[PDB]
Write an enzyme that holds these catalytic residues in place. Sequence first.
Site, PDB file in Angstrom:
ATOM      1  N   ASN A  11      -7.596 -26.065  28.745  1.00 45.01           N
ATOM      2  CA  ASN A  11      -6.630 -25.706  27.604  1.00 45.01           C
ATOM      3  C   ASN A  11      -5.971 -24.448  28.202  1.00 45.01           C
ATOM      4  OD1 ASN A  11      -5.756 -24.349  25.309  1.00 45.01           O
ATOM      5  ND2 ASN A  11      -7.307 -24.223  24.148  1.00 45.01           N
ATOM      6  N   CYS A  16       0.037 -29.269  23.374  1.00 48.49           N
ATOM      7  CA  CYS A  16      -0.296 -30.277  22.436  1.00 48.49           C
ATOM      8  C   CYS A  16      -0.814 -31.623  23.009  1.00 48.49           C
ATOM      9  CB  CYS A  16       1.339 -30.522  21.669  1.00 48.49           C
ATOM     10  SG  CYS A  16       1.820 -28.990  20.805  1.00 48.49           S
ATOM     11  N   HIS A 257      -5.196 -30.178  16.204  1.00 46.84           N
ATOM     12  CA  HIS A 257      -5.845 -30.421  17.526  1.00 46.84           C
ATOM     13  C   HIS A 257      -5.628 -31.514  18.073  1.00 46.84           C
ATOM     14  CE1 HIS A 257      -8.823 -29.807  20.621  1.00 46.84           C
ATOM     15  NE2 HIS A 257      -9.745 -30.434  20.118  1.00 46.84           N
ATOM     16  N   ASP A 274     -11.644 -34.194  25.213  1.00 48.39           N
ATOM     17  CA  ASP A 274     -11.356 -33.020  24.550  1.00 48.39           C
ATOM     18  C   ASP A 274     -11.222 -31.851  25.389  1.00 48.39           C
ATOM     19  OD1 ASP A 274     -10.682 -30.890  22.588  1.00 48.39           O
ATOM     20  OD2 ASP A 274     -12.645 -31.408  21.405  1.00 48.39           O
TER      21      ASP A 274
END
Length: 343
Positions: A11, A16, A257, A274
């Site tokens: 991250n 996005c 998210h 994720d």
Amino acid sequence: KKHTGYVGLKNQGATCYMNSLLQTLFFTNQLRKAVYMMPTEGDDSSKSVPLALQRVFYELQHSDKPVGTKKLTKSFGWETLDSFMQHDVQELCRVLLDNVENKMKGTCVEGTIPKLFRGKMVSYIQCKEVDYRSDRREDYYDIQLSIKGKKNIFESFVDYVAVEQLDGDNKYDAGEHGLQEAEKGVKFLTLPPVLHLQLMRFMYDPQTDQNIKINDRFEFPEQLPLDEFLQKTDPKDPANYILHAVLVHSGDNHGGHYVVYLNPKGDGKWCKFDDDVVSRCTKEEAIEHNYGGHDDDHCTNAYMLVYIRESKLSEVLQAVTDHDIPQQLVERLQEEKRIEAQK
Ligand SMILES: [Br-]
Ligand SMILES: [Br-]
Ligand SMILES: [Br-]
Ligand SMILES: [Br-]
């Protein structure tokens, strides 16, 4: 390589859909191998998108730690705080694929991109009262499906091929026949081995005056028969597609998210990607639990699906090995790592 066998991406800001899309492209094995082949020696590390994608894929294939993307974003120049918020997933995809296709031109893998992702459509205009039609070929690399007011993907395809009336004061200019009432629409001639469908949950300016997210229920299947949307069909190769990726977003328009579910082998064994955490999940979680809706008394749902032509499945997902990465490329990325290790 964790315990799913697969590693995540870091991250690093509001990118996005980016990590979702990179995972999707990474597990398009035929594309990955082809990307490993581009003559990126002598390229500028700072400036080269082809090299930057080579690097990320190599890291996803070998690294045991979450992979960074900084050089990737720099190269195609989306570095400002909100640069991914101003675009959509299909736009980034085209940015990446066009750089890659352009690198592959004149190489042993030229045409990998259109081979895997390009389909053909006929766009037609038929006048009512005058004998005139204009049929013209159109190519696509992805399909934007409407989902507002549609129960499922089949209705979306129905709506996509629906006839549209052209009537004054929106009459077609029929040349020698002057202004004429007409019918226009599109039909599919060919569907690509890899089929990128964006579901239009995120939509324009409803006149006044926001980008909004539709979180209505919208069903899609594990197995997708599209033969009946083809102008003519092949007996030996039906247009049967198998679900490969479900790109998911949780929340509303403004902030949310981004997660992607993949069964990268194509066997129905699904993982959840994720960012840095990759874990295995049930098929229901990857699929039904991403239909959206407002059900129990829900903001989590797909905005993009990737399907693979069943006949071409086991090929598109063909094994990649270490030997698929050319030595020159391995050496260069290894040296950069060594430079970095000098802090
Ligand atoms: Br990085
Ligand atoms: Br930008
Ligand atoms: Br969308
Ligand atoms: Br609903």
